[PDB]
Scaffold this active site. Structure first.
Site, PDB file in Angstrom:
ATOM      1  N   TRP A 101     -14.097 -21.730 -37.748  1.00 10.70           N
ATOM      2  CA  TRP A 101     -13.665 -21.923 -39.133  1.00 10.70           C
ATOM      3  C   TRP A 101     -14.246 -20.845 -40.039  1.00 10.70           C
ATOM      4  O   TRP A 101     -13.573 -20.404 -40.979  1.00 10.70           O
ATOM      5  CB  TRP A 101     -14.004 -23.321 -39.666  1.00 10.70           C
ATOM      6  CG  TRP A 101     -13.185 -24.362 -38.950  1.00 10.70           C
ATOM      7  CD1 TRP A 101     -13.606 -25.356 -38.125  1.00 10.70           C
ATOM      8  CD2 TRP A 101     -11.764 -24.486 -39.023  1.00 10.70           C
ATOM      9  NE1 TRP A 101     -12.551 -26.099 -37.669  1.00 10.70           N
ATOM     10  CE2 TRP A 101     -11.395 -25.579 -38.214  1.00 10.70           C
ATOM     11  CE3 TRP A 101     -10.763 -23.775 -39.701  1.00 10.70           C
ATOM     12  CZ2 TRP A 101     -10.072 -25.991 -38.054  1.00 10.70           C
ATOM     13  CZ3 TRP A 101      -9.460 -24.193 -39.527  1.00 10.70           C
ATOM     14  CH2 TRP A 101      -9.104 -25.277 -38.721  1.00 10.70           C
ATOM     15  N   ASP A 110     -17.690 -24.099 -47.151  1.00 12.45           N
ATOM     16  CA  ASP A 110     -16.718 -24.967 -46.491  1.00 12.45           C
ATOM     17  C   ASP A 110     -17.487 -26.130 -45.859  1.00 12.45           C
ATOM     18  O   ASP A 110     -18.068 -25.983 -44.769  1.00 12.45           O
ATOM     19  CB  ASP A 110     -15.930 -24.195 -45.448  1.00 12.45           C
ATOM     20  CG  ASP A 110     -14.951 -25.026 -44.653  1.00 12.45           C
ATOM     21  OD1 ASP A 110     -14.853 -26.250 -44.935  1.00 12.45           O
ATOM     22  OD2 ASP A 110     -14.291 -24.434 -43.764  1.00 12.45           O
ATOM     23  N   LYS A 114     -11.862 -35.288 -42.763  1.00  8.58           N
ATOM     24  CA  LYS A 114     -12.864 -35.425 -41.687  1.00  8.58           C
ATOM     25  C   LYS A 114     -13.864 -36.499 -42.035  1.00  8.58           C
ATOM     26  O   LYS A 114     -14.172 -37.402 -41.264  1.00  8.58           O
ATOM     27  CB  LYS A 114     -13.544 -34.086 -41.409  1.00  8.58           C
ATOM     28  CG  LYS A 114     -12.593 -32.911 -41.285  1.00  8.58           C
ATOM     29  CD  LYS A 114     -12.664 -32.327 -39.889  1.00  8.58           C
ATOM     30  CE  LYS A 114     -11.404 -31.563 -39.532  1.00  8.58           C
ATOM     31  NZ  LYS A 114     -11.593 -30.100 -39.761  1.00  8.58           N
TER      32      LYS A 114
HETATM   33  C1  LIG Z   1     -10.671 -29.120 -40.276  1.00  7.25           C
HETATM   34  C2  LIG Z   1     -11.427 -27.904 -40.865  1.00  7.25           C
HETATM   35  C3  LIG Z   1     -10.706 -27.000 -41.602  1.00  7.25           C
HETATM   36  C4  LIG Z   1      -9.173 -27.093 -41.705  1.00  7.25           C
HETATM   37  O1  LIG Z   1      -8.787 -27.990 -42.744  1.00  7.25           O
HETATM   38  P1  LIG Z   1      -7.225 -28.177 -43.060  1.00  7.25           P
HETATM   39  O2  LIG Z   1      -7.175 -29.250 -44.071  1.00  7.25           O
HETATM   40  O3  LIG Z   1      -6.629 -28.518 -41.762  1.00  7.25           O
HETATM   41  O4  LIG Z   1      -6.820 -26.847 -43.585  1.00  7.25           O
HETATM   42  C5  LIG Z   1     -11.353 -25.997 -42.266  1.00  7.25           C
HETATM   43  N1  LIG Z   1     -12.719 -25.943 -42.180  1.00  7.25           N
HETATM   44  C6  LIG Z   1     -13.441 -26.807 -41.413  1.00  7.25           C
HETATM   45  C7  LIG Z   1     -14.961 -26.674 -41.285  1.00  7.25           C
HETATM   46  C8  LIG Z   1     -12.796 -27.805 -40.742  1.00  7.25           C
HETATM   47  O5  LIG Z   1     -13.568 -28.599 -39.938  1.00  7.25           O
HETATM   48 CL   LIG Z   2     -16.358 -23.938 -36.062  1.00 10.48          CL
HETATM   49 CL   LIG Z   3     -11.825 -28.703 -35.881  1.00  9.87          CL
END
Ligand SMILES: *Cc1c(COP(=O)(O)O)cnc(C)c1O
Ligand SMILES: [Cl-]
Ligand SMILES: [Cl-]
Ligand SMILES: *Cc1c(COP(=O)(O)O)cnc(C)c1O
Ligand SMILES: [Cl-]
Ligand SMILES: [Cl-]
Ligand SMILES: [Mg+2]
Ligand SMILES: [Mg+2]
Ligand SMILES: [Mg+2]
Ligand SMILES: [Mg+2]
Lengths: 360, 356
Positions: A102, A172, A196
């Site tokens: 990510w 993030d 999440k």
């Molecule tokens: C799931 C995830 C993403 C992607 O998020 P989307 O809503 O699918 O764009 C980005 N960063 C992290 C750390 C994630 O775990």
């Molecule tokens: Cl990752």
């Molecule tokens: Cl993931």
């Protein structure tokens, strides 16, 4: 019926009371005789929900008054480009700390839009750790420094956050937001897809220092300016009302169990059950992360070879476990144990792991 | 406890779709998880995702050379995503202005490239759709953009122009799948779901595949989503689930032709009431351009307007206040608004007139 253990990595388990609450009022919300999905986002019933979701987040993470909470569509992935679109101006650098896949995706999008830098990376050693903050290469013309607090695919996590004064720190936090207390004023902006650890897919929480980003950026499409959403309190165009509602309900549940401090205690305990199982397995299970970087949200591991990996995962699925297959890019196994995953699911997984080991 | 849901967006949904959602909210498809708790890469989710696309394809008879995308960001993000992808240098984003939503789309294009107004009824405060023979088109148009139903003004295209020099593009947010469509007339159609198709949170984009890119952000390329079947990042899974449910309801009542019959009866109830009111209620749209989806009207003065809307609210009607930009009244009668609600509105309109 049979047992189901939900280790899905995203979207993921929700706390039952949030779902039961939604179910009970799905047709008649707040005595309006309409679903919350059938309301105007300008209705007072909806505005109440929208404001409460903000106030719960504010209280739970203790967000300062000079920060605003945005509810945006597009996922964390859209934030990967919206952030450099707003802050990565000419002559400046989008500086990234790479601690997983990510992080690389975030970086790639800034590369499309400006000068980027890599402050530190553990990519060479396959992202098994968080680099030491002393290794961070910082630049006087950095627009921001960007990190990934929890590296969802690799199972590593920041234990703490760097003190950064030359640029805003951006994070993030999709897979560990509100899994523990946070000193929000360490950051200029925090973002997280909700699916999440905060509820449903379809809304992205963006906590932003208002003065870093409440100003119009020339040449940026209206919907892609933070300013737009700050000014309109995330009501510029139609919001994802059911997602925000469900987010509210999940936040109420976090508050009800004692907030971030209490959920951290629960999260450390569930994580310990799984890591002790790995650590007492005499190498039958091998965790990807180095011990000082082990994530409390996503536990990544392998068995000694791919054949055993597959037999383990097939046995799990037959016994009711959902979502344990590692991310497609890395293979192995991944037990996602976000806030709402119950501890007895973790105990169940431990039992599975021990009997599989003993019977292998 | 009577309530009549004339909300303009988000809006009434079919009771069977909401009841179905309620019943399985905790245990979807015997998985013992909510649809909300599933991975978007699960087969469980993937079948719902595909089923929603399949139902749209069937119901609108979408040809094979069109792809159906489920995106986030609302129709508003499409306003910029479209020129971002198609408004290349030396080409022109050509707009037909038939209301304020048309204006909002044209504004975003002006950020990114050359624009043009093919035709506009703005001067006359958008009381009608312009004659297609009036369009001013350009050899180098990248597209011709229209708004099929002008949600704030209460006008609607009766049919669509035959455009062959450039793709015809349509913001159908407030009338998509309210009647049969000839999708081959268009290069692209887009709509937030929250009026005729589902709850807010998902945007349906029907795109001629071969029609649609260096330097555009990954998430803002149509090709990203076409290539990944709208599974590039996490989609709004519950909204797509609800969209499926709404589409199953439309299919069950007989499809696009059947829902058009219902919609025409709903609109007939209100317009007849207006036309028979001897000037007590006055519709904004010229007759020939009257929308079947948003019926806009005013009383003879602002005070009666206000008295009517107050009386309406007291009587359980929701959402009838006109858009703030134009005032008056607006009865939104999207697919799931039942005929009984329009009958109730009529009866209130008639009683109010009698008692004034
Ligand atoms: C799931 C995830 C993403 C992607 O998020 P989307 O809503 O699918 O764009 C980005 N960063 C992290 C750390 C994630 O775990
Ligand atoms: Cl990752
Ligand atoms: Cl993931
Ligand atoms: C409702 C509407 C929009 C706005 O949609 P969002 O999802 O709020 O961006 C755009 N165009 C038309 C014609 C609409 O009726
Ligand atoms: Cl309009
Ligand atoms: Cl509108
Ligand atoms: Mg409480
Ligand atoms: Mg239990
Ligand atoms: Mg059926
Ligand atoms: Mg008649």
């Amino acid at each position: 019926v049979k047992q189901v253990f939900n280790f899905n990595a995203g979207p993921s388990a929700l706390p039952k009371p949030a779902l039961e609450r939604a179910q009970k009022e799905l047709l008649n919300f707040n005595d309006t005789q309409m679903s919350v999905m059938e309301l105007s986002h300008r209705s007072q019933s909806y505005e109440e929900v929208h404001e409460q979701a903000q106030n719960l987040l504010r209280e739970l993470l203790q967000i300062p008054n000079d920060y605003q909470i945005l509810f945006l569509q597009g996922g964390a992935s859209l934030q990967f480009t919206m952030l450099p679109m707003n802050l990565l101006t000419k002559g400046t650098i989008g500086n990234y700390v790479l601690t997983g896949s990510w992080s690389e995706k975030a970086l790639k999008e800034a590369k499309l839009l400006g000068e980027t830098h890599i402050a530190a990376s553990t990519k060479a050693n396959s992202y098994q750790s968080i680099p030491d903050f002393s290794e961070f290469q910082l630049n006087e013309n950095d627009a921001y420094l960007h990190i990934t607090s929890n590296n969802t695919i690799y199972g590593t996590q920041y234990q703490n956050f760097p003190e950064i004064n030359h640029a805003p720190l951006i994070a993030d936090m999709s897979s560990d937001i509100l899994s523990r207390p946070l000193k929000v004023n360490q950051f200029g902006m925090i973002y997280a897809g909700a699916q999440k650890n905060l509820g449903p897919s379809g809304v992205t929480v963006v906590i932003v220092k208002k003065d870093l980003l409440n100003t119009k950026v020339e040449q940026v499409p209206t919907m892609l300016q933070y300013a737009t959403h700050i000014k309109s309190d995330s009501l510029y165009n139609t919001p994802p009302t059911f997602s925000i509602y469900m987010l509210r309900n999940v936040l109420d549940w976090i508050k009800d169990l004692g907030g971030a401090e209490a959920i951290a205690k629960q999260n450390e305990e569930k994580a310990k059950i799984i890591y002790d199982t790995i650590d007492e397995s005499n190498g039958f299970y091998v965790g990807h992360a180095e011990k000082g970087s082990r994530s409390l949200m996503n536990v990544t591991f392998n068995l000694r070879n791919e054949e055993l990996n597959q037999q383990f995962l097939a046995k799990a699925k037959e016994q009711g476990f959902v979502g344990l297959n590692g991310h497609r890019s890395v293979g192995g196994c991944r037990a996602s144990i976000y806030n709402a995953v119950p501890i007895d699911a973790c105990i169940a997984l431990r039992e599975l792991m021990i009997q599989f080991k003993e019977n292998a």
